[PDB]
Amino acid sequence: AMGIAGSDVSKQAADMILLDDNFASIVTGVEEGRLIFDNLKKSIAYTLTSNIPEITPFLIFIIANIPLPLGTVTILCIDLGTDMVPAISLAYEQAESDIMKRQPRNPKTDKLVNEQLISMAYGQIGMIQALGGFFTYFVILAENGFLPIHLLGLRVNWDDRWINDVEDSYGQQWTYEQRKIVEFTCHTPFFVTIVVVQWADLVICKTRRNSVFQQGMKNKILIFGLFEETALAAFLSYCPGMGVALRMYPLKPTWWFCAFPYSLLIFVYDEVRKLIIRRRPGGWVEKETYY
Amino acid sequence: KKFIWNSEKKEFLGRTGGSWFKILLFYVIFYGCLAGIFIGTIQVMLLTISEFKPTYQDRVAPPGLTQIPQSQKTEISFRPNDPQSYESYVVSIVRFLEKYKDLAQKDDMIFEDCGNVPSELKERGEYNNERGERKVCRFRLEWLGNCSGLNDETYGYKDGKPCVIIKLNRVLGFKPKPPKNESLETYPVMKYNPYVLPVHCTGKRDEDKEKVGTMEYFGLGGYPGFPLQYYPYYGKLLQPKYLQPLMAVQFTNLTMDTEIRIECKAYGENIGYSEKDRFQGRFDVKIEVKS
Amino acid sequence: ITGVAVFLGVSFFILSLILEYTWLEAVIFLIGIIVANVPEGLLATVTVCLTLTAKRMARKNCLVKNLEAVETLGSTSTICSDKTGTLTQNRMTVAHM
Amino acid sequence: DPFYYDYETVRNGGLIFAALAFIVGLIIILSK
Amino acid sequence: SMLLWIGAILCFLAYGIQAATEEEPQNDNLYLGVVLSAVVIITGCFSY
Numbered sequence: 001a002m003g004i005a006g007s008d009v010s011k012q013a014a015d016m017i018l019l020d021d022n023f024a025s026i027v028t029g030v031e032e033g034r035l036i037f038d039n040l041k042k043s044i045a046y047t048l049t050s051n052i053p054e055i056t057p058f059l060i061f062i063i064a065n066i067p068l069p070l071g072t073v074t075i076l077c078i079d080l081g082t083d084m085v086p087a088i089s090l091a092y093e094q095a096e097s098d099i100m101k102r103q104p105r106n107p108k109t110d111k112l113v114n115e116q117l118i119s120m121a122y123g124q125i126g127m128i129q130a131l132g133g134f135f136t137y138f139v140i141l142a143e144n145g146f147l148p149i150h151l152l153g154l155r156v157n158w159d160d161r162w163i164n165d166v167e168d169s170y171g172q173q174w175t176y177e178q179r180k181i182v183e184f185t186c187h188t189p190f191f192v193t194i195v196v197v198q199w200a201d202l203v204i205c206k207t208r209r210n211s212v213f214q215q216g217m218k219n220k221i222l223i224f225g226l227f228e229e230t231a232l233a234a235f236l237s238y239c240p241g242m243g244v245a246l247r248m249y250p251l252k253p254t255w256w257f258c259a260f261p262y263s264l265l266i267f268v269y270d271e272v273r274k275l276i277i278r279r280r281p282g283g284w285v286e287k288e289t290y291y
Numbered sequence: 292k293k294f295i296w297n298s299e300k301k302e303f304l305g306r307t308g309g310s311w312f313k314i315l316l317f318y319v320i321f322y323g324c325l326a327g328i329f330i331g332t333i334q335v336m337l338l339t340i341s342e343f344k345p346t347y348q349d350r351v352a353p354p355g356l357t358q359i360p361q362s363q364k365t366e367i368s369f370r371p372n373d374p375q376s377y378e379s380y381v382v383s384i385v386r387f388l389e390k391y392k393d394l395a396q397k398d399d400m401i402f403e404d405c406g407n408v409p410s411e412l413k414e415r416g417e418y419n420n421e422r423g424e425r426k427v428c429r430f431r432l433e434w435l436g437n438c439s440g441l442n443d444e445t446y447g448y449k450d451g452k453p454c455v456i457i458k459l460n461r462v463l464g465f466k467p468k469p470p471k472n473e474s475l476e477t478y479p480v481m482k483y484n485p486y487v488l489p490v491h492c493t494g495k496r497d498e499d500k501e502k503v504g505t506m507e508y509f510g511l512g513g514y515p516g517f518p519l520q521y522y523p524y525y526g527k528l529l530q531p532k533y534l535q536p537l538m539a540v541q542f543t544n545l546t547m548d549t550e551i552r553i554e555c556k557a558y559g560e561n562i563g564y565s566e567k568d569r570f571q572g573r574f575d576v577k578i579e580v581k582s
Numbered sequence: 583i584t585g586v587a588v589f590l591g592v593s594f595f596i597l598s599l600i601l602e603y604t605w606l607e608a609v610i611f612l613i614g615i616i617v618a619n620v621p622e623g624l625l626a627t628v629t630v631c632l633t634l635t636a637k638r639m640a641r642k643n644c645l646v647k648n649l650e651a652v653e654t655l656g657s658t659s660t661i662c663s664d665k666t667g668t669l670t671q672n673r674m675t676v677a678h679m
Numbered sequence: 680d681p682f683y684y685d686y687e688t689v690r691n692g693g694l695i696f697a698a699l700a701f702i703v704g705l706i707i708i709l710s711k
Numbered sequence: 712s713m714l715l716w717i718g719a720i721l722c723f724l725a726y727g728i729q730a731a732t733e734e735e736p737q738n739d740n741l742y743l744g745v746v747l748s749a750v751v752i753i754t755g756c757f758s759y
């Protein structure tokens with residue numbers, strides 16, 4: 001209704017009020033509506049992908065009885081720490097095309113979270129994201145003489161608080177706190193690596209159809225978030241006594257670049273599909289993957 | 292609500308039969324590709340680690356002090372009279388000492404008699420396979436005094452007044468440095484400053500201190516320290532079946548049917564401790580011999 | 583969301599006892615798997631995002647009492663407006679000469 | 680001894696990078 | 712918000728079951744419930 005030229009009873013009943021009485025607001029209204037609707041698809045996807053690498057270690061931790069690759073504390077720093085700032089930034093993204101040109105969605109045919117989104121994130125991007133994490137995990141352990149092949153079934157004796165003669169494949173003996181300090185130190189890059197892959201997943205999920213360059217990275221919020229996210233993660237590992245309060249220890253530099261390729265690979269994969277969606281409007285690329 | 296089994300379009304689980312095959316092919320090819328990448332990345336990582344020396348050893352800088360009888364809680368409670376009560380404890384002792392008999396060291400080729408007194412630490416070349424499979428210094432069970440597992444008490448071990456040994460964590464390349472003559476805390480139960488790393492055990496608690504009046508230490512050459520000559524360790528692959536030096540303590544007059552605490556402390560220039568790891572060069576134990 | 587979660591949790595709950603694990607702990611996993619599967623930060627993300635979009639509406643004097651209503655305008659397929667006041671200016675006014 | 684790391688160095692190093700990083704996105708977001 | 716709540720209660724319930732069985736179990740699942748619930752409360756406050 002119109003705020004200054006409308007019946008009071010009607011205004012209360014209405015779900016939206018126009019103060020200026022400019023009927024034009026409707027136009028902007030649907031514009032935003034169809035716009036925000038999409039950007040949410042984008043936003044939801046970013047957080048969802050994160051869960052596949054979030055959960056994955058716990059799973060193998062039981063399957064192969066290995067030391068726990070990822071701490072629950074860090075997960076919180078992803079779902080509710082770093083990831084949030086980029087997630088908010090996604091909304092600011094401008095429209096890929098002039099949405100006003102398209103028909104109304106159909107509430108039956110088209111849905112917010114389609115089956116495609118799942119396959120795209122849980123099935124592919126997240127799975128690649130997780131693989132990068134395990135790589136780092138295996139790398140750190142080996143670099144201190146705990147060989148991947150040798151890590152199988154090691155959980156049982158590992159988590160015991162009294163066995164201080166654990167034998168690594170190199171042959172040394174380790175006390176409980178040390179090898180734990182390592183497990184915690186190992187947890188920290190998993191978190192770090194997660195941000196590294198969540199870089200790519202952020203960019204690719206900025207656009208549904210057009211290429212990355214085509215859209216352009218003019219979204220200031222997105223940019224600030226990447227730096228903010230990176231800074232937080234870095235600080236999280238290098239502040240005094242984080243290994244004491246949150247059981248998260250510093251990181252040896254070579255660790256940071258552990259999964260830079262894995263994320264890059266992610267970026268390459270999505271972009272090429274976006275091009276494939278563009279070149280051909282054929283269903284297989286579209287129906288299977290066009291969330 | 293759950294009738295997606297079939298449809299007029301012949302959808303199975305709401306999906307066409309041919310396309311199923313198409314999705315199956317995509318996933319299989321994609322998953323294989325990811326694993327193929329992941330494994331190949333791991334192969335790289337294998338080649339970034341030497342086979343003789345670990346790349347990072349900073350974590351184990353403080354050595355550790357394990358116990359032969361690994362109690363669920365470092366607590367020993369049993370009946371002197373009852374064999375069954377201490378049977379399980381005895382078994383652990385048996386397995387550890389099994390690879391220490393004179394018969395076990397049958398091949399003179401791989402065994403060097405270091406000597407019957409402490410002597411100079413035996414540096415054995417640079418850690419490379421340019422030399423051959425290096426040599427191990429022997430260690431007779433006879434060296435253990437009145438705590439010999441297979442001698443005076445071949446199966447008995449200790450029915451009362453139990454023996455307990457400590458062990459140094461086997462560590463690649465550690466050059467122990469015995470403490471200087473003048474240490475204020477140092478209680479000189481022995482004058483062997485030049486070639487021994489002393490370990491002394493005290494109740495720590497005043498109540499416990501009073502509870503145990505005296506303890507008997509047994510060492511090679513009657514010396515209560517690790518022999519400097521045996522070290523340094525050269526790695527399992529380089530030195531298969533290497534034998535860690537062993538030091539034993541048998542408690543004397545004891546308080547029966549009471550719980551007491553004993554703190555075993557290693558000393559020397561190159562040893563640290565932490566108020567968060569009760570085993571990092573330090574040592575605690577709870578012991579109760581109830582009749 | 584939950585539908586996949588239960589399937590994963592149930593499947594793991596199967597493979598849990600398939601391996602040497604006791605019912606006592608197998609449940610703990612099923613709970614945990616379903617739990618960690620649940621999105622957490624998303625709630626505040628979506629809500630914050632929605633409020634932000636409304637702000638710019640409020641910047642242009644488009645207000646909504648119900649916050650979840652901003653999306654509805656974009657997601658519409660048919661409209662019905664009142665000629666008087668809404669469309670007209672409701673003023674007798676000089677038209678043609 | 681090879682069993683010691685100058686952690687404090689890279690520790691401080693990381694701190695510096697993060698601090699610098701914050702001001703950069705800050706500068707970006709407060710573009711004028 | 713309700714869905715998150717069910718998870719939280721589930722986390723809280725889980726810790727109790729865990730505590731009874733094991734000895735000195737880690738306070739991880741418990742910690743999870745507190746933050747999860749707190750998120751909703753903060754979310755609700757902002758919304759209101």
Ligand SMILES: CC(C)CCC[C@@H](C)[C@H]1CC[C@H]2[C@@H]3CC=C4C[C@@H](O)CC[C@]4(C)[C@H]3CC[C@]12C
Nearest residue numbers: 139254257258259261265328331332335336339
């Ligand atoms: C397009 C993509 C898939 C090409 C893949 C290249 C990969 C296999 C290469 C390129 C850069 C390499 C990484 C560079 C840096 C390091 C740090 C080192 O301490 C561990 C190995 C590691 C992590 C390397 C692993 C192998 C590596 C990841």
Ligand SMILES: CC(C)CCC[C@@H](C)[C@H]1CC[C@H]2[C@@H]3CC=C4C[C@@H](O)CC[C@]4(C)[C@H]3CC[C@]12C
Nearest residue numbers: 230234253254256257688689690691692693696
């Ligand atoms: C622009 C972006 C995408 C490029 C990649 C980010 C790189 C340059 C940043 C991100 C995090 C950074 C690391 C954070 C912490 C440290 C500790 C410091 O004592 C040594 C450098 C090191 C290891 C930094 C190296 C540079 C680094 C890896």
Ligand SMILES: *[C@@]1(O)O[C@H](CO)[C@@H](O)[C@H](O)[C@H]1NC(C)=O
Nearest residue numbers: 436437438443452507508509541
């Ligand atoms: C030793 O254990 O046994 C001897 C009996 O054969 C005994 O005389 C001797 O005092 C004991 N010594 C110690 C240190 O226990």
Ligand SMILES: CC(=O)N[C@@H]1[C@@H](O)[C@H](O)[C@@H](CO)O[C@H]1O
Nearest residue numbers: 471472473481482483484485486
């Ligand atoms: C090998 C040996 O016993 N050396 C000691 C020396 O440690 C001590 O400082 C000195 C007392 O003045 O007496 C010497 O006999």
Ligand SMILES: [Mg+2]
Nearest residue numbers: 051054079618
């Ligand atoms: Mg999560």
Ligand SMILES: [Mg+2]
Nearest residue numbers: 664666667668
């Ligand atoms: Mg009207």
